Design a protein around this nucleic acid. Structure first.
Lengths: 71, 76, 74, 75
RNA sequence: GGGCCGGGCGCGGUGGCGCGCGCCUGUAGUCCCAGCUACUCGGGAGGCUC
């Protein structure tokens, strides 16, 4: 669904051109909410969460994307 | 500012600790060349970045992963 | 005319002074016993007026003066 | 007749003090002819002075303090 | 010797500049200090480029 779908689209952008896209990650402890975004300055794909169970997957999606950049 | 593998992690821990009351902690990941990736962190005042290569990704990701998981416990 | 907000009157006044930095003049009248201030900027043909009894304004004015006093001296 | 910048500020402070009980202070500002003439009166007594670029600094802060502290009656 | 080392909105500060707070958002590519004293004009150290 939303998250499972989202990642797909993102990993689609990373592959389309892994040299023009980047991935932001905004943690706002106070208001209490996380926010992942993968853009190519021609495609704003963003995902926000506030629930706690969502950190783990967001962090993994981050750690991974990094590995494809260093592979 | 560009730091060395370690340094970056300690500065980063602070960014979270220096924002637990307010403000947002940014982090952007990126494929870099001119194999490595560019890692940046900012609280809006102080900036910091590092360059992670395939040679240390395992060792770095070990601590980086604990760091993100521990400092980000504050959501719903 | 008189104005209901310092915002308007300010530029209104500043602009007016600007279009003739030689005839224009600004006067201020404070009556402690009645508890009110009153700024007016004239051209001896045109007249702007601001009246207040809110302390929140004394600074806005002391500033305006300090502002007009800058143009007159540059 | 003009008064020395400093003196001016003292007489002015005094005008305000005399007009507290029941009276009014008038202060007017106009380009002198670079300088700018500054005058103030309570109706009868009249004081004036000229402030230049040479003196705007010491004067503005002083003048600023004078206006702020002496206009208190408001809401 | 000259240009550049981030941009945006809101509030605050000062006559004004530097400046403070909040939020948003970039690059391969910023740090430090409070100062200037009528002034669209504070000071030091690095790096890039004509």
């Amino acid at each position: 669904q939303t998250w499972e779908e989202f990642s797909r689209a993102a990993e689609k952008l990373y592959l389309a051109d892994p040299m023009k896209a980047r991935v932001v990650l905004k943690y706002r402890h106070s208001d209490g909410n996380l926010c992942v975004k993968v853009t190519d300055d021609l495609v704003c794909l963003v995902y926000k969460t506030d629930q706690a169970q969502d950190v783990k997957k967001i962090e993994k999606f981050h750690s991974q994307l990094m590995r494809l950049m260093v592979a | 500012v560009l730091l060395e593998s370690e340094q970056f992690l300690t500065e980063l821990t602070r960014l979270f600790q220096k924002c637990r009351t307010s403000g947002s902690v940014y982090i952007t990941l990126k494929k870099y060349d001119g194999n490595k990736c560019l890692l940046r962190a900012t609280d809006g005042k102080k900036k910091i970045s590092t360059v992670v290569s395939s040679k240390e990704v395992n060792k770095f990701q070990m601590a980086y992963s604990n760091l993100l998981r521990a400092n980000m416990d504050g959501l719903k």
